[PDB]
Amino acid sequence: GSHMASLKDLEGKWRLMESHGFEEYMKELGVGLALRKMAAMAKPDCIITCDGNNITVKTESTVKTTVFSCNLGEKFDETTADGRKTETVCTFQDGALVQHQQWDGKESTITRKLKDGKMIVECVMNNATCTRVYEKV
Ligand SMILES: [K+]
């Protein structure tokens, strides 16, 4: 039952092909209605790059840019696209980029995994999971 994954196959630019439950996970995060339904109308490209241990995930909408960098495993502060201020940590575990965010008791996860050349992106907050499929541009 052999598998292997490596951080660098997630490198490249990723077009959103698909989405299930996004608007709800965002409601769970406390995303205001305007940014919630507007965010869903945006078809953003996820752009991932890495320099060894150091990773950068960029999110581009036509009208915004949010971006973070980090050495994997080290806690770092994050300005999420919706204004949340989290203490984030990124690891590569079980063949996936894992982004754990913590903010005021509450917390969330975003896992990014290469699967058949597609990047599968599942977000989880307090039992509200979303999945979004990006294709390689
Ligand atoms: K690992």
Residue numbers in the entry: -3 to 133
Task: Please give the exact wording used by the authors of the publication that reports this structure.
Fatty acid-binding proteins (FABPs) are involved in the uptake, metabolism and intracellular trafficking of fatty acids. Based on epidemiological studies and animal knockout models, the isoforms FABP4 and FABP5 were identified as potential diabetes and atherosclerosis targets. The aim of this study was to develop a dual FABP4/5 inhibitor and, to this end, high-throughput and fragment screens were conducted with X-ray crystallography as a follow-up method on those ligands that showed appreciable affinity and favorable physicochemical properties. Structure-based drug design (SBDD) based on initial hits from high-throughput and fragment screens yielded 216 ligand-bound structures of human FABP3, FABP4 and FABP5 isoforms, many of which were at resolutions of better than 1.2 Å.
During this exercise, 229 FABP crystal structures from various human and mouse isoforms were determined, many at better than 1.2 Å resolution.
